[PDB]
Amino acid sequence: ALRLGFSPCPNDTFIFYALVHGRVESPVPLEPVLEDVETLNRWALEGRLPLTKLSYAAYAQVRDRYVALRSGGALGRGVGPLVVARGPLQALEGLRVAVPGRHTTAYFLLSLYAQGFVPVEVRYDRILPMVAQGEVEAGLIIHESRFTYPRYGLVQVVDLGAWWEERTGLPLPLGAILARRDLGEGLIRALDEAVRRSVAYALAHPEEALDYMRAHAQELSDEVIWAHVHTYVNAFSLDVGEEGERAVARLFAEAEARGLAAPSPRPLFV
Ligand SMILES: [K+]
């Protein structure tokens, strides 16, 4: 009955596998809608879905319409987006950089890191080939590209997650699961517990989610699928925690300092 948006990447299908297949209790039935994260980011601007995975940078733009669940998100220290190129670069000034979506946390972090580049916005899976073929000088990559970029002969220019850690001493908030405020407080709290249970179920029976992950990432090898969930699913996926809350506050403080997001007294989490 409730549409639930998330991406077909192994981390999201791993996290929602149990909830989608009735392996854990849910307060209401759910209808998954699998989309690219930038598509979900755009949809959230219109408040389209009542439940949706969203880039944390994008959540900062819809706090009056959505609240973040404490569970199901993507935050951490070794999950940062990377910038890659065909060879070392002195700087990104004046260079074309393929990016996965202007509303992504990846794009926001690249913008904190460097300011003289020319962004070329494309689907994330077009980035590695575009860099290798010389269509752009660098690429901001997310998802499973962090494991496959060497296959394209590329090198890491910067690991923005590491950059963020050095700058803030905190993990990097990448993606969150948001509930539309009009669903009501009780149902939202119940959904937060449901999502936490789904994460815990997959952590306890990972192999059970495998068919579902493959079904939505058919071009990926099982090796890449297992590496992807191992990298992106961690303690923060079960609960943002006190450190994750501090991290999100710092990310939003940086956004507010650049007029990218409007301040709000509303609590960040359910
Ligand atoms: K690898």
Curated annotation (Swiss-Prot):
Enzyme Commission number(s) from the entry: 4.1.99.29
Membrane spanning stretches: none
GO biological process: menaquinone biosynthetic process
GO molecular function terms listed in the Swiss-Prot or TrEMBL record: carbon-carbon lyase activity
Catalyzed reaction equations: cyclic dehypoxanthinylfutalosinate = 1,4-dihydroxy-6-naphthoate + dihydroxyacetone
Keywords per UniProt: Lyase, Menaquinone biosynthesis
Family: Belongs to the MqnA/MqnD family. MqnD subfamily.
Name by which UniProt lists this protein: 1,4-dihydroxy-6-naphtoate synthase
Gene: mqnD
